[PDB]
Amino acid sequence: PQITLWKRPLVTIKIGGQLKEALLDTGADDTVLEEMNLPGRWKPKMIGGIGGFIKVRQYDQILIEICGHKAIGTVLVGPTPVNVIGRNLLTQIGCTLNF
Amino acid sequence: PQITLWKRPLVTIKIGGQLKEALLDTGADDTVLEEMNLPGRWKPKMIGGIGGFIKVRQYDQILIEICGHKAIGTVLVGPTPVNVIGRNLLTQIGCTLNF
Numbered sequence A, B: 001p002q003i004t005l006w007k008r009p010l011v012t013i014k015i016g017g018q019l020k021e022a023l024l025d026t027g028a029d030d031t032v033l034e035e036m037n038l039p040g041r042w043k044p045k046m047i048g049g050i051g052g053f054i055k056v057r058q059y060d061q062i063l064i065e066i067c068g069h070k071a072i073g074t075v076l077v078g079p080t081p082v083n084v085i086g087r088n089l090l091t092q093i094g095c096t097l098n099f
C-alpha cells in the first residue's frame, strides 16, 4: 500500500506468534522492539540512538510479518521508546520512499 | 524520485543558505539538525529516542529545500549524532512509504 506521513506510520506486526504495533522507521538501520519474550538463542549487543547506547538481545533469523508481508531477519529486543521496524526488514518487504 | 532502502536514505538539503546532508526519516516526528547558527528567536526543547534525551533549540517557520522541493516548518537544532528530516517536513514534499 501507499502510506502517507501525517500520522505516525504504525502497523501491526506478528512476531513469536503475537501481534504488536510498530513504527516503520527509515532512519533506523536495525529493528528494535520493546522488552518481550522471544524463543530462540540470542547474543548480547549494543546499539546507539539519538541519546546514546543501549543494551539489547540480538535474535537472528526471526520470522516477522509486517502488514501481512513476511520477513526473516535480525530483531533486537531492548529498552527502546517504541517498537521500530528498520531498513533490515523494510528492504525485505519491498519498501521504498517516493516523492 | 524513488529511494530504495538498501543504504541510508541520505539527501542534500539547503537550510539557512547552506548545504547539508540529512536522512529522510519516517520514524522522526520532528526535524533535527546538527548545531548551526540560525538567526531569529528559538525555544528550548528536549527530544528523546533510543539511549535517552538531548537538548535542542526549536526554530519555527524555517525554509528547507530537499532535493528540489521546498518546505517550511519547525527545525530543531542541537548536538544530534545525525541530521534527520522528520514527518513535519516530509509530508510537505509529498513523501510516502510504498510496499
Ligand SMILES: CCOP(=O)(COc1ccc(C[C@H](NC(=O)O[C@H]2CO[C@H]3OCC[C@H]32)[C@H](O)CN(CC(C)C)S(=O)(=O)c2ccc3c(c2)OCO3)cc1)OCC
Pocket: A023, A025, A026, A027, A028, A029, A030, A031, A032, A047, A048, A049, A050, A051, A052, A053, A081, A082, A084, A086, B025, B027, B028, B029, B030, B031, B032, B047, B048, B049, B050, B081, B082, B084, B086
Ligand atoms: C553517527 C552515528 O551515531 P550513533 O550510532 C546513532 O546515530 C543515529 C542514527 C539515526 C537516528 C534516527 C532514529 N533511528 C534510530 O534510533 O536507529 C537505531 C536502530 O538502527 C540503528 O540505526 C540508526 C541508529 C540505530 C529514528 O529514525 C528516529 N528516532 C525516533 C525513533 C522512534 C527511535 S530519534 O532520532 O530518537 C528522533 C528524531 C526526531 C524527533 C524525536 C526522536 O522525538 C521528537 O522528534 C538516531 C541516531 O550513536 C549514538 C551515540
